[PDB]
């Protein structure tokens, strides 16, 4: 019964605006603590990209936490790269960082990223 | 050596997952009341699509309201169709609601949707 108009750039515009909200710290509602470091983010975005975060915020004792500590074993530069991805679509992979990037994606239960890390050490010795 | 990979279906998969959260009422943080109807949503999604909602949740007396009442003149069906659009990309229009949809989009300061409505008044 409806004429439906799909806006092919909507999803990207939305994601772009979510990133501006992030970097202006608007409605951010949680801090992710990774060893030293702190990353402000929106819980819903986290939950929309990782089933790890989904399992966390879906716990009624944890829904309303405003701070979340990750595994001490986790690399802060790896998580920062994954966090920017989640907000931008762009995974910035270096020869220097890729090690921990992949351990993070794995930890954050995001295989499509794991797989592009493996599919990246094609350009390898 | 150095690199940057863009996942082209990522934005799309995020939006898809945001809409499942909504449809399961997971982390929704506001109810929008439009006459006698109520719609649960995520404030960040609202602010990421509508200029009106950006201003509401950016006023610090309102940032943390969990109920927002739209102007009484706003139509529940028109609102529903825009909220679905925010969460899916799909604007579902019919001849018997297209003008209400357009009025609502003006109010929510989503002007490209308004132009699309106007422009979809070719056949007609």
């Amino acid at each position: 019964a409806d004429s439906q108009i799909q806006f092919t750039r909507h999803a990207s515009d939305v994601l772009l605006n979510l990133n501006r909200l992030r970097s202006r710290d608007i409605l951010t509602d949680v801090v992710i603590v990774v060893s030293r470091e702190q990353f402000r983010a929106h819980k819903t975005v986290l939950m929309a990209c990782s089933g790890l975060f989904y399992s966390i915020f879906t716990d009624q004792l944890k829904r309303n936490l405003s701070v979340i500590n990750l595994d001490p074993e986790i690399n802060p530069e790896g998580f920062n790269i994954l966090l920017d991805f989640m907000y931008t679509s762009r995974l910035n992979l270096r020869e220097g960082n890729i090690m921990a990037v992949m351990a993070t994606a794995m930890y954050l239960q995001m295989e499509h990223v794991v797989d592009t890390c493996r599919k990246f050490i094609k350009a390898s010795e | 050596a150095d690199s940057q990979i863009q996942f082209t279906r990522h934005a799309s998969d995020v939006l898809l997952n945001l809409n499942r959260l909504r449809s399961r009422d997971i982390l929704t943080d506001v109810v929008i009341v439009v006459s006698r109807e109520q719609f649960r949503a995520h404030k960040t999604v609202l602010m990421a699509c509508s200029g009106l909602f950006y201003s509401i949740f950016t006023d610090q007396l309102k940032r943390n309201l969990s109920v927002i009442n739209l102007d009484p003149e706003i139509n529940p069906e028109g609102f529903n169709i825009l909220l679905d659009f925010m969460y899916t990309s799909r604007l579902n229009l019919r001849e018997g609601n297209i003008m209400a949809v357009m009025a609502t989009a003006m109010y929510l300061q989503m002007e490209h949707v308004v132009d699309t409505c106007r422009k979809f008044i070719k056949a007609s």
Binding site: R9, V14, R24 | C49, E111
Partner: peptide, 16 residues
């Protein structure tokens, strides 16, 4: 039918 639109959003979260 399902027509496509290519319009970018007119809404841009302010940078200040």
């Amino acid at each position: 039918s399902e027509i496509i639109s290519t319009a970018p959003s007119s809404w841009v979260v302010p940078g200040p």
